[PDB]
Every structure is written in C-alpha cells, then in structure tokens.
Amino acid sequence: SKEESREFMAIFPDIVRDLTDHTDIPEVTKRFAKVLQYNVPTGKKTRGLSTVIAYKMLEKPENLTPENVRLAGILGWCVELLQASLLIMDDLMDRSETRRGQPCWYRQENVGFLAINDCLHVESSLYSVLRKYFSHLPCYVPIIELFHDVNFKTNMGQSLDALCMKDGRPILSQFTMKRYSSIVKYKTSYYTFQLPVSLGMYLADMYDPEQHRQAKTILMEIGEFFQIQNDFLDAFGDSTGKVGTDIKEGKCSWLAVVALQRSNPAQRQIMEEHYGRPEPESTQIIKNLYIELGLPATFAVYEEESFNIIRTHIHQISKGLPHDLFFKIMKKIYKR
Amino acid sequence: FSKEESREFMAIFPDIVRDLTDAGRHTDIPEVTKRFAKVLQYNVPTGKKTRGLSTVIAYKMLEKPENLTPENVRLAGILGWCVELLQASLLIMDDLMDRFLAINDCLHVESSLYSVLRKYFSHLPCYVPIIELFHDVNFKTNMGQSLDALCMKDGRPILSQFTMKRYSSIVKYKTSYYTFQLPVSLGMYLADMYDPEQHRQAKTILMEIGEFFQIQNDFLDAFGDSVGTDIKEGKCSWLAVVALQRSNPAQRQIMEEHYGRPEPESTQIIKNLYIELGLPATFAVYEEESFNIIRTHIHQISKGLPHDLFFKIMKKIYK
Ligand SMILES: CC(C)=CCC/C(Br)=C/COP(=O)(O)OP(=O)(O)O
Ligand SMILES: [Mg+2]
C-alpha cells in the first residue's frame, strides 16, 4: 500500500531528531545523524513495514487507531535500526565493496574500523527510541527483552557462519544441511521473520508464549525457504540489477551444501580447488558444476514441496492465531 | 577490597558462563555456544575487576545493614559482572582496532549482559531502572568513543580540536559514565534508591573523580616508571591539551611536526617539550587543587548519601 509506505517513511526523521536533537557535544551528535541517515532509511524497508502489517492483522480492528499504527511504525524502525547495525558490522567483517549498490559505511572516508563503534551505537540507539514511546505501556519490557534476545541469537548465527571459514578459505567439511539450517535460523530468520511478528503480537498485548512458539515454528520454515531462494537466485537470477558474488565470497550457500551432497569425488575436488576464489574463471567453473549437478531442477522440486508442507502447517495453526497473516507472508516470499 | 569480598565476587563468574552458554538447555548449536564460552572465559574474568567489585562495595555501603543478606550481596556481584561484561566488550573493540577474536564478539559480549540482567533481575522492582541505566550508559559510551575519534583525520591528530572542553567531554562520555557512575547507580537501584536528586548528587562527585583518574592516567603515560604510546597514537591526552595551552608559536610548531608520529625520536621530542613546558609542575598543582575540591564536595554531599563510599573511591584513585 502507498499510504502504509509513506506513513511509515515519515516516522524516520522524527526518530533521527529523538536520537540527536547532549547539547555539550554537537559535533558527535551531528555525526550520529549522518550515521543514521546513510545506513537506516535507504532502499526497501521490508522488515519495518512487515512489523506494521503484522500488527494490523493481529490487533482487534477497533484498536487500530492512527496512534497505535504509528507505534507499530516506530517498532518497525527499531527493527531497521537493529538491521542497520548488523549490516554495518557484516560489511566490515566480509570486506564488501557495496550493499544495495551503495558503498559500505566502513569504506567512507575516516570510518574504517570506527564502523565497529557505529554498529554498537546504532544498536544501542533503538532502546532509547523504545524508552521514549513505550515506557508507559505493558509491552515495554517484553519488547526490550525480545530485541536483546534476537541480538544475542543473531550473533550466534554470525559466529556459526564464521566457523565455516578459516583464514579467508571455506571449510567444505563444515558445509552440511544441518549447519546451513542453523546459520539461517539464528543469523537471519530470528530478526527478519520472528522479530516483526512477535513485535506485532506484543503491541496487540498477546503475551502467551505458546502463541509466539506456534508463530516461530511457521516463521522459521518460511525463513529457511526465503534464504534458500535468495541463495539460488545469487547464481541463477537475471542480473534485478545485482551481480551475485556468493561463490567468490566462499559462502555456506544452499547451492554449495547441496552441490557437496550430490558430488562424486572428482566433482568434490572442483569445489575444493575453485570455491571461494577471487578469479572470475573459478566462479564460472563452480556455476558450471551447479548446472552439471542439476541444482536448478533440485530447487524447483524443493520450492514446490516446501510450499505444500508450510501451507499444511499454517492450516494446523491454533490458539487463536490468524492464518491470513502467515498465508500473506507465504504469498509475498513464494510470489503465489 | 577484602579477601572475602573478592573471592565471593570471583566465584560468581563460572555460573554466568553456564547461564549464557545454555547449560541445562539442550541446544541445536553446541559448537558456536562452546566457542562463546571460550570468548567469555578468555576476555572477561582476568585482571583486577575494579568496576565489578566497586558495584558490590557501593551496594554494601548504600543498603541498610539488616538487608545485606548473602543473596542480595550475590545479586550486587551479578550486577558487577554485567559491568565487567560491558568493560570486556569495550576492551575487545579496542583490541580489534589495534590488530581468535571475531569482530562481532564485542557486540555479542555487550548483548550478553542484558541476558544476565533478565535472568536475575526481571522480577525485582530495580529491573527497569537498571536496564534503562545500561541502555543510556551504552549509548553515551559510544558517543564518547566517536568524540575521541573526531580528534583524528587521515591518521593525523587535529590539534585545533585538542581543547580542554573537548577533553573533559571525551573523559565524561567515553570513560566516567561506565567506570564511575554505573557501579554506584547500580548499587543505589539494588538498594531501592530511585530519587533522581540522589543519583544527580553522586554523579557530580563521580564525574569529578573520573576526570582526575583519567588526567593522572594521562600524566603517568608519559612520566610514569615502566610503556606509554599516547604520543605515538596522537591521543587527545591532558598533557597534549595543556601543552597547546602553554606553548608559544615555536613550541606549537614542535607539537604540529612530532605529535602522533611512529618514530621513537618524535616521542622523545614531545616528552622533552612537555618537560620544558612545565607539565610535571602543572600536574602537581592540578593534583593538589583537584584533591582539595573533590574532598570538599564529598564533605558537602547531602540528599542522605553516605560520605564513606565516595571517600573510599577518592582514596583508591589518589592513593
Ligand atoms: C551479528 C552480525 C553482525 C550479523 C550479520 C547478519 C547478516 Br543479515 C549478515 C549478512 O549475511 P551475509 O554476509 O552472508 O550476506 P550479505 O552480506 O547480505 O551478501
Ligand atoms: Mg556480508
């Protein structure tokens, strides 16, 4: 919706003012405004907007006031602040050139490893936003605890991802489907899928842990498909205006994991020799192996089977959770 | 810090590691959880733990003697370890900018203190004041780190930025809030002391003590008996700030040419300039005058706050 998008985007400048406008240190508050402006509001705010839509589908219709929808928007921006902090740090760790076509924050003049402090600063800032707008509401402490717990879990995911590499070289013995599933769950699914929905639930005063658990079961399955589709399109997508670098980066990708499952010893040796190498010819060799191993056909089967399995699980959801929310998430990911 | 206080405090650490690395819960990610145990063990419990123990001593000197149970003194110890988790995250961030530590270990160790707070304090009246204090001190400490960084550009110190106003702000935000205010305000909250005027009264004195602590530290970096790298690193130190205040144009030119250079000869040139500028005598005057002002302010402490706590902190720094 155009109206939902514009109402959401209009909140961002107020949050920057809340975090910057400490009158004894104006130079560093002006700098922090630039950190937020560069890293937080550009490109798609899918997670932030999903927080608002989750709330709108969980709350009683008569309680959906402009005031409460704006509170859902502020929680959405707190998700975007967490994500901005994570991506500032990840770009430094991976020594990436760009994100969404923008030069990475750490590459800007006189940032570099100061990006680590900026990461911690941006993550810390969301709790000041929560205090300003939520400190008098019953959802305050549950929402604080959710953000701190998702941060902790996301760090476990990032560190597990790092345990698949040694001295900038992929450890292919670590590239198992069990490890892949765990990386996706902790590194991406918690902050991308669980956090927006659990925030919507708390703002709607839904505190039943069993409701959050039932939601989690579905959201982790959808999150797994989301990342697998993302991994698939990195190699096999139409260059969306993005050029995929997962192979060059030596990522523990669904493609790399399934390639190792399906590979004979000779095919395994091609992965060992060429995976995670900077040479364009090495990326071409890996892509050619993925084609040879029939990974496109394997993804097509997984895409249809996973859709049916998740649809079945959503029909089985109970304890008064709305099915339409989970069907709508399923539709926007699978695009059907 | 007494033998009993120190030993009881240090005995809590292994429980905090078990709490954070899912001991009792049967985790689906045991290899990264085992790694996080090693991150905590290798970086958090080593050295003196002054901030952690200061949290326990603050609580013991603020609480009613009747309420000082083993259980409550242990809770003060857990709050002290949350301060030491913050300290460890800041030291890791320092080590990462210097050089098995991963970049996200500083974020992860910082985040872990909030898991400890939730575990032990979520059902107590002091919970929200304590988490809001950590949120605020976290944000202010990051502001302080960035203010320090604004004194350097393209690997060179920006000496025009080296003002006493900027120096005082760096020390307050980067160091004094988490080192001095945080332990005492935590002790006060655990003792159910919520009065904003009491917290403000403590803050005035603790920011003054924090400033002396850092100025003494800066002085000893150049003039202590060993090795200090503040000059080589181009740090906005009290010595550099006062050197610029006291320098004639020729002396300023020596700072401009030799401050923040890697050559050992350039460090010796700056130390020789500090000597001819009378920074030792200037420090001696500052130390006596600051001691007298802080002693006066502690004697004047009101709002029902105990003097002995602030005198114990003061005497620990001034020796
Ligand atoms: C704790 C912490 C800093 C987590 C980062 C989480 C995320 Br989301 C990292 C991004 O994942 P990845 O580097 O695999 O892909 P890309 O950079 O989007 O191409
Ligand atoms: Mg990356």
Ligand SMILES: [Mg+2]
């Ligand atoms: Mg990464």
Ligand SMILES: [Mg+2]
């Ligand atoms: Mg991708």
Ligand SMILES: [Mg+2]
């Ligand atoms: Mg990328």
Ligand SMILES: [Mg+2]
């Ligand atoms: Mg020093």
